[PDB]
Amino acid sequence: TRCKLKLLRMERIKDHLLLEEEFVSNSEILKPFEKKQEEEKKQLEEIRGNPLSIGTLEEIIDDDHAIVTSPTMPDYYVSILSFVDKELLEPGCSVLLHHKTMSIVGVLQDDADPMVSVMKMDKSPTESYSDIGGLESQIQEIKESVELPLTHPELYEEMGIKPPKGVILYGAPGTGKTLLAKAVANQTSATFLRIVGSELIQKYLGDGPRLCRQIFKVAGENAPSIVFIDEIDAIGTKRYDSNSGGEREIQRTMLELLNQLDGFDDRGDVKVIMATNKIETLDPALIRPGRIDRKILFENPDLSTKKKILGIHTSKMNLSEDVNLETLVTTKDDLSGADIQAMCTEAGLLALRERRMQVTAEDFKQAKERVMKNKVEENLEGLYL
Amino acid sequence: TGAELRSVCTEAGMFAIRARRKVATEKDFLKAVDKVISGYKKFSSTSRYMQYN
Amino acid sequence: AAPYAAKLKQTENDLKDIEARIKEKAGVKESDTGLAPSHLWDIMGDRQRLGEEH
Amino acid sequence: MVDESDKKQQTIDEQSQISPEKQTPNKKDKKKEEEEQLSEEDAKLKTDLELLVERLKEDDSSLYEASLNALKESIKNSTSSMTAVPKPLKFLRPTYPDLCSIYDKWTDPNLKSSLADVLSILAMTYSENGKHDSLRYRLLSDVSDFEGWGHEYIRHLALEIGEVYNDQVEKDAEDETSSDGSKSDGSAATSGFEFSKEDTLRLCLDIVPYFLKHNGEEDAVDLLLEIESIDKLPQFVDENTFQRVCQYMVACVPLLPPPEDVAFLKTAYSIYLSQNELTDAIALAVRLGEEDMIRSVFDATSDPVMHKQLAYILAAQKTSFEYEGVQDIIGNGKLSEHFLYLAKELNLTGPKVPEDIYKSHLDNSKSVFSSAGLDSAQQNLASSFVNGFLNLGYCNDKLIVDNDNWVYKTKGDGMTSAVASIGSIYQWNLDGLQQLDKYLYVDEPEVKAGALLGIGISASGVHDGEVEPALLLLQDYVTNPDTKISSAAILGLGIAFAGSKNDEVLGLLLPIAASTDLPIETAAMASLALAHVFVGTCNGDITTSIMDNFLERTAIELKTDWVRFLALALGILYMGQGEQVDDVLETISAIEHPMTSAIEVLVGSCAYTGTGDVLLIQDLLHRLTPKNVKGEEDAEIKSEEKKGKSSDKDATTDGKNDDEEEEKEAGIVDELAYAVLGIALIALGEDIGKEMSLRHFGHLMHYGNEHIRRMVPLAMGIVSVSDPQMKVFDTLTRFSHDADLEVSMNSIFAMGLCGAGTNNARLAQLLRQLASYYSREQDALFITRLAQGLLHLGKGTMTMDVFNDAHVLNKVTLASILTTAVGLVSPSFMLKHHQLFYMLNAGIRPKFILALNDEGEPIKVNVRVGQAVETVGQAGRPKKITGWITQSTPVLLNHGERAELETDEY
Amino acid sequence: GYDRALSIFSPDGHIFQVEYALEAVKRGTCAVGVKGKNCVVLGCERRSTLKLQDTRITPSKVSKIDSHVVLSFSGLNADSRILIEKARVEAQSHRLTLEDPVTVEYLTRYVAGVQQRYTQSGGVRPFGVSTLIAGFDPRDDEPKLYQTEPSGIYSSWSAQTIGRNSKTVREFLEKNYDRKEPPATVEECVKLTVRSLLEVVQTGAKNIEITVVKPDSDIVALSSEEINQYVTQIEQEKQEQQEQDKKKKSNH
Amino acid sequence: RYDSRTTIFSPEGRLYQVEYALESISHAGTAIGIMASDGIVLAAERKVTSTLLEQDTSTEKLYKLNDKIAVAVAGLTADAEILINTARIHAQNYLKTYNEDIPVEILVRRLSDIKQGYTQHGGLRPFGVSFIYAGYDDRYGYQLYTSNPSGNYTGWKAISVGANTSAAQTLLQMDYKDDMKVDDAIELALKTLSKTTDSSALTYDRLEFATIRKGANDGEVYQKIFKPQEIKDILVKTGIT
Amino acid sequence: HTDCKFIRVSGAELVQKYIGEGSRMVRELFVMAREHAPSIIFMDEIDSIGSTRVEGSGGGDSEVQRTMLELLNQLDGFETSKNIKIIMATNRLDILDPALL
Ligand SMILES: Nc1ncnc2c1ncn2[C@@H]1O[C@H](COP(=O)(O)OP(=O)(O)OP(=O)(O)O)[C@@H](O)[C@H]1O
Ligand SMILES: [Mg+2]
Incomplete structure (x- = not known):
């Protein structure tokens, strides 16, 4: 009660305070100027006419004119006018056009697309270790590759070797490789994109590889960044049969993805996290290295690991009075972390049902048998015995 | 792969980095090959007979 | 869960107060693109723009 | 049913x-x-x-x-x-x-x-x-x-x-x-x-x-003591009992006015004293800042045990940890009275042993130079100060200095400061005095002055146990009646002894700080030292300073510079206290002049600190008022006005920093956002107000200890490149310095772009250059923090010169001050009875998880790292001790405290 | 490619059938060998299914190849039967010809030869079985333990672990055991084997089986009583151990 | 895959052929041996039926190998035919050579070896037969084994092989006891069989039975395949009919 | 009985080709659900047919797998949820779509 109150006091007062000052000051910005900053506003509003169309700047033409491509089929011949100079514009940049007579207003789109909003995350994960149950060595490796060069370059200076350009996570299903990536994303204080790897794949000629290219384009500008692309067995080399639309698509996306990642001078400071679940469909030109510079195997928990996952989860569940943790982990063999996460939620559930306001021993043991049914192989003592 | 040959020197360097040592021994390059090769074997051809021999 | 549940309820109230800043912040802005010395060129541009050869 | x-x-x-x-x-x-x-x-x-x-x-x-x-x-x-x-x-x-x-x-x-x-x-x-x-x-x-x-x-x-x-x-x-x-x-x-x-x-x-x-009542709290001290070990471990006690006190911080809040924490200290761990005790005794409490924890180990034992070694270690050195003076000489060994004990309390340990660290960290090569004109001056800013703390760069070629080309005020930068190469070091002596006995009075400043810097790390005190060298200079000489002398004495208000140091400084009838600009340094001396421990709110501030005002108003510095010295003086400072606001206010009204808003921040949220609303009503009155109508004065405005702005920032630190860590985020809305409000409304608030902002961050360091300094910097007063950049870099090479990778590129790109005045260029060098210490040599380190709620003393200098438009005179930048953090090591210079292992964790403590005790899981590594800055501060598996037991719990680890092996 | 017969060599220079045989070893039961200086102890994990399986009429994992040579095994239970039979007929053929007790060294080479034979020809797979063969020499008291692998390479090892999760036993064994000073008394030797199997069995002393082979053609298989007696002493000292770290940490 | 020969192994050290040959035995009818310390009863369920199938004059999954050991059959009948004949010859070969009948443990071992050989050597199928062995020999008394098609054997006090293996085994061990009785054992096979089978009639025409006892006479050992009209008679007594 | 918004969603999702075929519009489902919260989702992938189908990693299995996979990523999410619950109905779990469970 006292610990919560202490945090709650500081964060409510200041944030509520920052809110109230913004209200008062916002009015107060305006009064100083009225003809000293006002003038630029009046001239833009008149030239723009308010309605405006986009154009893409095709090229410049020497005499303060330019030629633009509209989103409609005809191109048009524009003149370069207004405040925005032609050293602030180059070909390959988006421009705004005036309604009545198409004219270079200036740029303000800055090559926006609705896919940038999707790349861009705003949601923040939990997530740090001490919510990651064991795998000490695995925690360490991803921290040295992805967290560390950014925070401390000092070690990288002293030795004088380039920093890891990526890491690839692979292993058994449901191992919770996803926590570790999330944990990296929270702690860094870096621009975190992603995306799912199933989002670059479409069916429309040439749109797919350009969406691949776009991720890097946004990262390289707002570098250092980290890019997490999930599920690379949705963008492998695999068969595609015949009489399919998607047979070209899968080929092209992957190709563009490959060049950008290697660079030709590279981004040089954007690290990547790839995660995947089938390594028998992965292409061979993406796990050879300069791309990725560790490769790490995840495996299902063992006794020490299980006790840690378990250990964190039970402390967030009330009254484990007659509950011994050790006796459960001993009997359990060959399970995922997913299965232990599940057993805590199930065991609490049985405690509710018992008409009991607390968990027991017997609530836990019943739940444990249930989840062993789900993940089972027996051909070890079937073959042997 | 010649690329993975480049990755040896980087990885060897990683071992010197966490050890806080200001140089890279002969020993830690031994580890650096061992990690890359042993990982790669996971995908293609496993095992040796020099695990007891 | 009363001793600490009370403080939780106050935390949701805080979330809405931070949201109200996002709205507020947008309410007054000041922007400008181009550079200030190109003001004379705007003057020219109205004479060409108005005109028809483009 | x-x-x-x-x-x-x-x-x-x-x-x-x-x-x-x-x-x-x-x-x-x-x-x-x-x-x-x-x-x-x-x-x-x-x-x-x-x-x-x-x-x-x-x-x-x-x-x-x-x-x-x-x-x-x-x-x-x-x-x-x-x-x-x-x-x-x-x-x-x-x-x-x-x-x-x-x-x-x-x-x-x-x-x-x-x-x-x-x-x-x-x-x-x-x-x-x-x-x-x-x-x-x-x-x-x-x-x-x-x-x-x-x-x-x-x-x-x-x-x-x-x-x-x-x-x-x-x-x-x-x-x-x-x-x-x-x-x-x-x-x-x-x-x-x-x-x-x-x-x-x-x-x-x-x-x-x-x-x-x-x-x-403090009485409720004293019933709690009784019951809990029974519970201390048989009901549950030491550790658990501790986490409750401080959860009670830290959570209710904002709503305890001054007299109430001291009175509650007394009882938490004592709870700690009763229980097994005296390690928990020493940390609270420091919070309070009372002399009285430091002595009981130091005594409790020294006096009972006749033998040397563990007991003497432990007392010294504990006092040694504050580098305000307020504890150092008090504890010394007990060691003499007992007389088992004078020699080990006296040296170990002293910050003399902290120099030795620094050499061990330096050995990993090596030397990489990156100093400017630029010579001739103001660029010569720029480079020669830059050499010291890169080799801060104990460094050896002797040979470069001995090349007296570049030294002598400095001129004017640049000559004094050039000698002063040299002193910071040998900052925190016995040796280095030599370099200073050559100049002091030859050429113009200017080099002589600059020598005294540097002495001040060198002496920061050796001034106890009566082993070359600064007091010894600098007394001779005070007597000499030339003003430059004498002014310089008392600036360095004040810096070195820091918080130490020893009889010789204090009392030399007591008749003096009392002549202001004669008109002398540089006599800012008269009060400015004594204020510095005073911070780190409870104040008398000395009658010497208070009398002289008033006298100066009577005499002159011409020197605007003189009176702005004075005003600040008073506010810095009252730091270390808040209860007694409610009185002096009135006393100051009795005499009323618009010029006196500037002094008051400053002092208000120190009295209200630690319950302030009334203070906040006040420092915002001030801001508005010039404009507002004008607002109603629409539908000699020069000096007084300017002091008026400028004071307020400093005061708003100081207030914030001090409140957020002590209060909820959550609240640190909110106060930064409020600042940004204050500056935005000013940029439009007053042209003159905007200038002051830029500079203030950098020290807002460094004081407040913001969690975020990546985004905010950088972003702000860009707007302010257009904006005049390049002194902005220096104030930002003191926050950004961080764990060198984490934050500061971004920083050198960002500060460097504006400097290198733009050159349109060498005056402008000089501020930019210095700012850059400050930021980085090569391969994480040290970190600066405003904070103690030993508490993270804590506030420093040595870092108060940094905090003073961001109130005025830039001056070459000011450059001389700026050399002084002190506020070191030691790297922890596991000590032994032969004084082992190596750490075994440590856990570091960017972010604590525990939500029982807002401070968050270390987790026991962490991420593991090697020997002899600096105690990391932010995103590494939580530090746990790994040694338990080799069958080793800490004696000195370290949570990421400044303190050096110490171990007992079975 | 290249694992579809034993007769492809592959460009990585492995005969896959041998490499894959090693992974089959894992399926069987832990087996541990430790030599002393007057004994060899040869112990193995005994799998327990249900109470409807016996342990009377049901085969142990330790098998006598003679009266001075013993064998424990890991691998397919089916495979191991013929491996053992053929080895045994050789052990007797040796007295038929020479009239000598079999040499320990001669025997191990014969069993590695049989696996090697299978491995060389492509008409068969090899026995997917690694064994440890313990014994004492015809008249010397010098203790001998040898290991075979499916490949038909034999080595001498002072102590070795094979079967299910062999590696985790290997590291503990490596530490505690010395070739500077092996156990002088059978009793500490037996308990070291018990300590090794403690880890991998978890609960039970009815999952640990001990047999000892000593010189002068003595082989004895030890009783459930004696094994339960050894495991309880280990269990008491281990309980005590935990307390001492807890004291020692407080004490410093 | 690594189906394609039987003399290969797989990346995991399984062999698909050994697994596939094993699943063959859960395609053919339930077979149950329950050992009691007063006899062993063998009981088996048929896997074929119809009003014009003759099954009321015949056994086809109870074979006396020799005169003191017999087997119940589960698996393919073709696979079964050859190995039953080989097994009977070796059991009886011992008879000739040593002039005393073969012990239980040796005969199961022999036949397991033959099984194993088809996997180990040549380009042949493994044999998909799981035989439940019930014997008596005076070394260990009553002995129950079953042999896997992998070709190894383990002793038992009750076992069930053939269809619905998992279900049967659970059923048997709920109501079994170590003291037991031979008469309680018969009733137990009949108990288990009702549940396990997918025919709800479960009448004489589907059922085989033999009980091997040394309590039958005294100093003598009697293997008795019951006849069809006894199998009917005992169904009233357990009340299934 | 629940009285929440369901987002049945019948036996395939390749039944919509008005904006083209769902290859990356599968994810659009979660957005539309989240707004109208609670998000109780029902899905049929009965999967009684094809005893072999789990070893695949795939030909044009790949299209429908890319649809199946993107569901899982979105579900587990990153990491905010609005009590999203997926009821599945299926014939067997031995005869199942690879990596659905
Ligand atoms: N070490 C752990 N600590 C805490 N929770 C765990 C741990 N391991 C597993 N879990 C829980 O189980 C879930 C299983 O992981 P999840 O299903 O996200 O798969 P993954 O293998 O990481 O997936 P993909 O290949 O799709 O990226 C985790 O997200 C978490 O909820
Ligand atoms: Mg994942």
Whole structure:
């Protein structure tokens, strides 16, 4: 009660305070100027006419004119006018056009697309270790590759070797490789994109590889960044049969993805996290290295690991009075972390049902048998015995 | 792969980095090959007979 | 869960107060693109723009 | 659920879920008829108690409401609670839940209100019996599981809280208020609270702090001491007891005014003193800042034990840790009195041993130079200061300095500062004096002055145990009547001794700081040193400084520079205190002039600190007012005005920084956002105001200890490149310095772009260059922090010169000051009796997880790293000790404190 | 490619059938060998299914190849039967010809030869079985323990672990055991084997089987009573151990 | 995959052929041996039926190998035919050579070896037969084994092979006891069979039975395949009919 | 009985080709659900047919797998949820779509 109150006091007062000052000051910005900053506003509003169309700047033409491509089929011949100079514009940049007579207003789109909003995350994960149950060595490796060069370059200076350009996570299903990536994303204080790897794949000629290219384009500008692309067995080399639309698509996306990642001078400071679940469909030109510079195997928990996952989860569940943790982990063999996460939620559930306001021993043991049914192989003592 | 040959020197360097040592021994390059090769074997051809021999 | 549940309820109230800043912040802005010395060129541009050869 | 009569005991419970027969009808009739049934009723109480216990498990609102409906009526209608006296009183056990069933299980707005009041009265009456305590206990530790009690039990406790809080808000108090109807004190409810506290401390956490802060007395806190000190190890480990105590104190920080807040933490220290760990003790004694408390923890280990033992070594270590050195002076000489060994002890308390350890670190960290090559004109001056800014702390770069070619090309004020930068190569070092001596005995008076400053810097790390004190060298210079010489002398003495207010240091500085009738600019340094000397420990708010500030104002107003510096020295002087500072605001204000009004807003920040949220709203009304008055109408003055405006802005920032640190760590985020809305409001409104607020901002961050360091300095920098006063960049870089090479990778590129790109005045270029070099120490040599380090709530002393200099438009004179930048952090190492210079292993974790502490004690899981590594800055601060597996035990708990680790091996 | 027969060599220069045989070893039961200086102890994990399986009429994992040579095994239970039979007929053929007790060294080479034979030809797979063969030499008291692998390479090892989760036993064994000073007394030797199997069995001393082979053609298989007696002493000292770290840490 | 020969192994050290050959035995009818310390009863369920199938004059999954050991059959009948004939010859070969009948443990071992050989050597199928062995020999008394098609054997006090293996085994061990009785054992096979089978009639025409006892006479050992009209008679007594 | 918004969604999702085929519009489902919260989702992938189908990693299995996979990523999410619950109905779990469970 006292610990919560202490945090709650500081964060409510200041944030509520920052809110109230913004209200008062916002009015107060305006009064100083009225003809000293006002003038630029009046001239833009008149030239723009308010309605405006986009154009893409095709090229410049020497005499303060330019030629633009509209989103409609005809191109048009524009003149370069207004405040925005032609050293602030180059070909390959988006421009705004005036309604009545198409004219270079200036740029303000800055090559926006609705896919940038999707790349861009705003949601923040939990997530740090001490919510990651064991795998000490695995925690360490991803921290040295992805967290560390950014925070401390000092070690990288002293030795004088380039920093890891990526890491690839692979292993058994449901191992919770996803926590570790999330944990990296929270702690860094870096621009975190992603995306799912199933989002670059479409069916429309040439749109797919350009969406691949776009991720890097946004990262390289707002570098250092980290890019997490999930599920690379949705963008492998695999068969595609015949009489399919998607047979070209899968080929092209992957190709563009490959060049950008290697660079030709590279981004040089954007690290990547790839995660995947089938390594028998992965292409061979993406796990050879300069791309990725560790490769790490995840495996299902063992006794020490299980006790840690378990250990964190039970402390967030009330009254484990007659509950011994050790006796459960001993009997359990060959399970995922997913299965232990599940057993805590199930065991609490049985405690509710018992008409009991607390968990027991017997609530836990019943739940444990249930989840062993789900993940089972027996051909070890079937073959042997 | 010649690329993975480049990755040896980087990885060897990683071992010197966490050890806080200001140089890279002969020993830690031994580890650096061992990690890359042993990982790669996971995908293609496993095992040796020099695990007891 | 009363001793600490009370403080939780106050935390949701805080979330809405931070949201109200996002709205507020947008309410007054000041922007400008181009550079200030190109003001004379705007003057020219109205004479060409108005005109028809483009 | 359905009635099923008396066939068996199972169906008897079922029978009474709809309608009791052993609690309703029978009992009611008996009580309302015969009074020999008073006897039957007494035996039947037990039976009735049991039937509740069985149906507790049932939760449905309807089958508790209605069942016990008529019993609720009976309190006043039929029994009238005094038909047989004693007998309803002891028969209130079961009738008390009946009332609670209408408060809480069923919600009828009209009754839920009314019956709160009833419940309070009867809680009191029945707690004389001390059986109201037992009623509470059977729901607190539980017998049965249902949702219902998890909400209900809070109400019973809430009755007590209700009344006790209100006695602070309304003066009439007691049961005169009909809001509770229950007496605030008396020997009837007081015994109830103590007993309630016991049961709730064991199982829960909720109400134990509420009771203290509502009584408001240091007395509540001293009862807590007794009970908890029993619990210290057999009920649960040391560790757990500690985390509660400080959770109580740190959480309620904002709502404790000055006298109340010192008075509470006294008791937390003492709790710590009683318990096994004296390590927890020393840390609180420091918080308070009182001399009195430092001495008891140091004494407790030194005086009993006749032998050297562990006991002497431990005392020294503990005082050694504050590099304010306020503890250093006090503890010294006890060591002399006892006389086992003078030689080891005296050196170890002293910051003399901290130099030696630095050499071990330096050895990993090596030397990489990156200094400017630029020579001729103002660029010569720029480069020669830059050399010192890169080789801050103990460094050896002797040879470069000995090349007197570049040294001599400095000119003017550049000559003094050039010698002063040299002193910072040998910052925190015995050796280096030599370099300074050559110049001091030759050429113009200028080089002589600059030598004294550097002495000041070198002496920072050797000034105790009567081993070359700065006092010794610099006294001779004070006597010499030339002003430059004498001014320089007292600036360095003040820096070196820092917080140390030793008799010789203090008393040299006491007649003086009292001539301002003669008009001399550089005599800012007269008061400026003494203010610095004063911080780190409780203040007298010395009568020397207060008299002289007033005198100067009488005499002159011409030198605007002189009087702006003076105003600040007063505010920095009062740092280390807040209770006594409420007085001096008035004293200063007695004499009223618009020029005096500038002094006041500054001082307001130090008096209100540590409860300030009134202070905040005030420093914002000020801001608005120039503009506002003008606003109404629309629908000699020069000096006074300017002081007026400028003061306010400094004051707003100082206020914030100090509050956020001590208060909720959450609140640190919010205060930065408020600042940005203050600056935005100023950029439009006043042209002149904008200049001051830029510079202030960098030190806003460095003081406040912002969590974020990546985004905000960089972003802000860009706007302010266009904006005049390149001194902005220096104030940002002191925050950004961080764990060198994390934040600061981004920083060198960002600060460097504007400098290198733009050159349109060499004046402008000079500020930019210096800022850049400051930021980085090669391969993480050291970190600077405003904070102590030993507390993270803590505030430094040595870093107060940095904090002073961001109040004025840039000056070449100011450059000379700027060389001084002191505020080192030691790298921890595991010590041994032969003084091992190596750490075994440590855990580091960017972010703590524990939410019991807002500070967050280290997790025990962490990420593992090697020997002899700097104690990391942000995103690495939580530090746990790994050594336990090699069968080694810390003696000195370290959580990421400045302090050096120390170990005992089995 | 290249694992589809034993007769492809592959460009990585492995005969896959041998490499894959090693992974089959894992399926069987832990087996541990430790030599002393007057004994060899040869112990193995005994799998327990249910109470409806016996342990009377049901085969142990330790098998006598003679009266002075013993064998424990890991691998397919089916495979191991013929491996053992053929080895045994050789052990007798040796006295038929020479009239000598079999040499320990001669025997191990014969069993590695049989696996090697199978491995060389492509008409068969090899026995997917690694064994440890313990014994004492015809008249010397010098203790001998040898290991075979499916490949038909034999080595001498002072102590070796094979079967299910062999590696985790190997590291503990490596630490505690010395070739500077092996156990002088059979009793500590037996308990070291018990300590190794403690880890991998978890609960039970009815999942640990001990047999000892000593010089002068003595082979004895030890009783459930004696094994339960060894495991309880380990269990008591281990309980005590935990307490001592807890004291020692407080003490410093 | 690594189906394609039987003399290969797989990346995991399984062999698909050994697994596939094993699943063959859960395609053919339930077979149950329950050992009791007063006899062993063998009981088996048929896997074929129809009003014009003759099954009321015949056994086809109870074979006496020799005169003191017999087997119940589960698996393919073709696979079964050859190995039953080989097994009977070796059991009886011992008879000739040593002039005393073969022990239980040796004969199961022999036949397991033959099984194993088809996997180990050549380009042949493994044999998909699981035989429940019930014998008596005076070394260990009553002995129950079953042999896997992998070709190894483990002793048992009750076992069930053939269809619905998992279900049967659970059923047997709920109601079994170590003291037991031979008469309680018969009733137990009949108990288990009702549940396990997918025919709800479960009449004589579906049922085989033989009990091997040394309590039958004294000093003598009697293997008795019951005849069809006894199998009917005992179904009334356990009440299934 | 729940009285929440369902987002049945029948036996395939390749039944919509008005904006083209769902290859990356599968993810659009979660957005539309989150707004109208609670998000109780029901899905049929009965999967009684094809005893072999789990070893695949795939030909044009790949299209429908890319649809199946993107569901899982979105579900587990990153990491905010609005009590999203997926009821599945299926014939077997032995005869199942690879990596659905
Ligand atoms: N070490 C752990 N600590 C805590 N929770 C765990 C741990 N391991 C597993 N879990 C829980 O189980 C879930 C299983 O992981 P999840 O299903 O996200 O798969 P993954 O293998 O990481 O997936 P993909 O290949 O799709 O990226 C985790 O997200 C978490 O909820
Ligand atoms: Mg994942």
